[PDB]
Design a protein around this ligand. Structure first.
Ligand SMILES: *C(=O)[C@H](CC(=O)O)NC(=O)c1ccc(CNC(=O)c2ccc(Nc3cnc4ccccc4n3)cc2)nc1
Ligand SMILES: *C(=O)[C@H](CC(=O)O)NC(=O)c1ccc(CNC(=O)c2ccc(Nc3cnc4ccccc4n3)cc2)nc1
Lengths: 175, 88, 88, 175
């Protein structure tokens, strides 16, 4: 009987046969996984809940809990940062790209949860008159090979929970 | 000896909605996208690469209700499949 | 009866390089990206979905020479696998 | 012996067994393919070779030949448009989204081959002082469900051959 008491929690395990089948069905087209005993996997969550001017993101704590635990289940050490300006986010991202553990890691997860407009992710000090935005382009530049050589050739997964404008995203059609 | 490397490679972004559009959130249940992603990671991490999983999340949003959104994969430079191999 | 549909769905963009970067072209041989895409489509259309094929093109660019570029998949809202089934 | 004399040319065929294996290995997670005998598949190529101010894209004709033939091999009727302004491209895209054949089609390919800057694809009249740019965002809006209901639930593949800035896209590392 599988058990969520283990370190992987509610995440379904990959059997030794499954791992061997995947390593055969797909050739040398899989990202190399580092030795479990010695790998220092890192993940970062930047979540903004309290904002100066824009409404409070009620429920964000449930998102932090779930994402933090999931990345841990997957093997990542999770750094949780809260209520940051676009400037703080940049500083924190820079700090993340400078972590020595990336040298002895095989992958990384970046998670941004905040309000958002068309142009990017909202800092805590965001308003219409004085925008506080982090561009998706900026995240990429900071984690790329120039600014983060430690993560060269390694999957970098970026996850964003945010609006991207005011529209409901739907059109009507008749059957 | 110095060698050349691509400045940008092995990236995958996953957004909660398509450009111009909102993403929904429950005050006690969290974000709809985040919750769905945790579900799909939990179920599929062991059998699919992360790109596949993201598609399945997308597919799970295919039928729109009153609060519709369509998660988007962006700026993909993965040259390989990324399997999480949970348990390893 | 009217029903709701996602405004944006079932899209996949494939660019020749990553943002900020050039894409290379031979005066008699054409574009490097285009040529590579034709090769990979020709070989893999019958066995892979288009997302897979695009990854393989990317992988084929993994080792950089003097004229390096990294094709990018963008704005993906495919909810399913798209197999071309050539011959059908 | 397989032969390129057929309509699929140099494109490797999918055997009846292969088609059945894929339809089993992956469930109802494949886009539906319309009956070959009655489907009206459309593709559009917009290629810019001659430009007013920016250098001539020598070799673009080899790209048109190859892409046109490939989309045909795959079953698409290929429309080839040449040397268009961003305004012309918009007009042509609008015309494409209004084609009745999309109703009796299962998919579409859009191909843009031109010069390009960071912000988008270059029209024939592009210069630094007077930009002539088509944004990738614009292509998507024109082919989406609002502006192209005929392609609702149908794969739309967009392919762009263009620069995205002036950089060589590389960083040095030592072994
Ligand atoms: C825009 O920037 C932000 C993005 C963000 O904060 O993530 N979006 C909003 O500001 C926003 C405003 C209002 C609402 C209202 N939410 C809903 O209408 C809503 C209704 C029902 C549910 N139900 C539901 C059921 N089950 C689950 C399970 C797991 C997770 C969520 C969930 N939700 C949700 C939301 N939303 C966002
Ligand atoms: C930027 O907007 C444009 C994008 C475009 O027009 O597609 N890029 C350029 O303006 C551009 C300027 C100069 C060059 C120079 N090209 C090369 O340096 C080059 C050298 C060798 C080859 N070799 C080669 C070999 N085999 C093949 C097979 C198939 C296709 C291509 C090919 N090429 C190519 C290019 N390029 C672009």
């Amino acid at each position: 009987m599988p058990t969520s008491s283990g370190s992987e929690g509610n995440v379904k395990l990959c059997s030794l046969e499954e791992a061997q089948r995947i390593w055969k069905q797909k050739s040398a087209e899989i990202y190399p996984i580092m030795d479990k005993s010695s790998r220092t996997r890192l993940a970062l969550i930047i979540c903004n809940e309290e904002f100066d001017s824009i409404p409070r993101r009620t429920g964000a704590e449930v998102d932090i809990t779930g994402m933090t635990m999931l990345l841990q289940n997957l093997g990542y050490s999770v750094d949780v940062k809260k209520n940051l300006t676009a400037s703080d986010m940049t500083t924190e991202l820079e700090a993340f790209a400078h972590r020595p553990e990336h040298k002895t890691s095989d992958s990384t997860f970046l998670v941004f949860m905040s309000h958002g407009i068309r142009e990017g992710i909202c800092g805590k000090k965001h308003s219409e008159q004085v925008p506080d935005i982090l561009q998706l382009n900026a995240i990429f530049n900071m984690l790329n090979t120039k600014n983060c050589p430690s993560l060269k050739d390694k999957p970098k997964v970026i996850i964003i929970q945010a609006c991207r404008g005011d529209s409901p995203g739907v059109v009507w059609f008749k059957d | 000896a110095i060698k050349k490397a691509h400045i940008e490679k092995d990236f995958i972004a996953f957004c909660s909605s398509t450009p111009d559009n909102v993403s929904w959130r429950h005050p006690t249940m969290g974000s709809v996208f985040i919750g769905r992603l945790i579900e799909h990671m939990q179920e599929y991490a062991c059998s699919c690469d992360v790109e596949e999983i993201f598609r399945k999340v997308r597919f799970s949003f295919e039928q729109p209700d009153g609060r519709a959104q369509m998660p988007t994969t962006e700026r993909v430079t993965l040259t390989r499949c990324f399997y999480l191999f949970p348990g390893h």
